């Protein structure tokens, strides 16, 4: 969640951004090597597996939320040419196989 | 003190750091034997006919 | 006669010249030791 | 009449040509190369 505090002086804000970044590095590195220990079998404690799962989920969602934002800002990645070629190819396939498209289920549908 | 949890320690262990986090890997063999047989064209990598 | 035959090879292939250096030294030190190199590149020692 | 005649796309693997990810050191840890490989390995 983006953090801004409107009044706050800039020496204080620079100090806060400094120390939050330090704690973030300590947090994320610990996530990184406790996952390796969990995968190799070195840990046997279940609370450390719960904590790592929690940390991992938060990191995944930070990344995934960035990916969605970049998708809307940086454009669709499928070009108009590649999209029309994919679409037209599928039409020719379905046309040659003589596929009859599925209808909406009527309410008096026997199945 | 008893060394009770030695794989899972409060830091990254020496073997763990070597194997995963940028320690020096022994890196013993490099392309030990990679010779095309004599009967093969160098470009095609297939048996030549007119050498 | 030296008829017992043993083949040697360095573990690191890049370390091959030092072995060759060592081979010349044992060839000086043991009077009836024979060292050959084969066609396939094996280094061979003959001893008794 | 080669065997890849009616193939829709070509040249699609021309960008990934060279890997040089190591020399680029980013200070941001969620943007670093290590974390992207981590997230690719472990959320599969």
């Amino acid at each position: 969640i983006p953090w801004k505090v409107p009044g706050l002086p800039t020496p204080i804000e620079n100090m806060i951004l400094r120390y939050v970044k330090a704690k973030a590095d300590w947090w994320t590195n610990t996530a990184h090597y406790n996952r390796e220990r969990i995968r190799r079998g070195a840990t046997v404690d279940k609370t450390v597996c719960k904590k790592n799962l929690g940390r991992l989920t938060r990191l995944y969602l930070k990344a995934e939320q960035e990916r969605q934002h970049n998708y809307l800002k940086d454009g669709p990645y499928i070009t108009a040419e590649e999209a029309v070629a994919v679409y037209t190819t599928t039409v020719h396939w379905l046309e040659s196989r003589r596929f009859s498209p599925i209808p909406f289920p009527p309410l008096s549908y026997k199945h | 003190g008893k060394r009770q949890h030695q794989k899972d320690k409060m830091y990254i262990t020496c073997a763990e750091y070597t194997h995963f986090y940028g320690g020096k890997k022994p890196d013993l063999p490099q392309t030990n034997f990679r010779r095309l047989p004599f009967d093969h064209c160098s470009l095609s990598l297939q048996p030549f006919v007119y050498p | 006669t030296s008829v017992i035959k043993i083949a040697v090879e360095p573990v690191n292939p890049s370390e091959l010249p030092k072995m060759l250096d060592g081979l010349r030294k044992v060839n000086k030190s043991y009077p009836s030791l024979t060292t050959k190199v084969e066609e396939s590149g094996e280094h061979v020692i003959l001893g008794t | 009449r080669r065997w890849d005649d009616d193939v829709v796309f070509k040249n699609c693997a021309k960008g990934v040509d060279d890997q040089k990810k190591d020399k680029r050191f980013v200070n941001d840890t969620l943007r670093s190369e290590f974390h992207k490989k981590f997230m690719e390995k472990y959320i599969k």
Binding site: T79, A80, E81, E82, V84, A85, T88, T89, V91, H92 | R35, F38 | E39, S40, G41 | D5, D6, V7, V8, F9, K10, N11, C12
Partner: peptide, 25 residues
């Protein structure tokens, strides 16, 4: 010794464009 053992365009990426694709683009 032959042997000694001791030593761009948008319609890039787009081969085979069919009629509907050319006409659409």
């Amino acid at each position: 010794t032959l042997q000694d053992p001791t030593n761009q365009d948008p319609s890039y990426y787009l081969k085979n464009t069919n009629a509907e694709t050319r006409e659409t683009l």
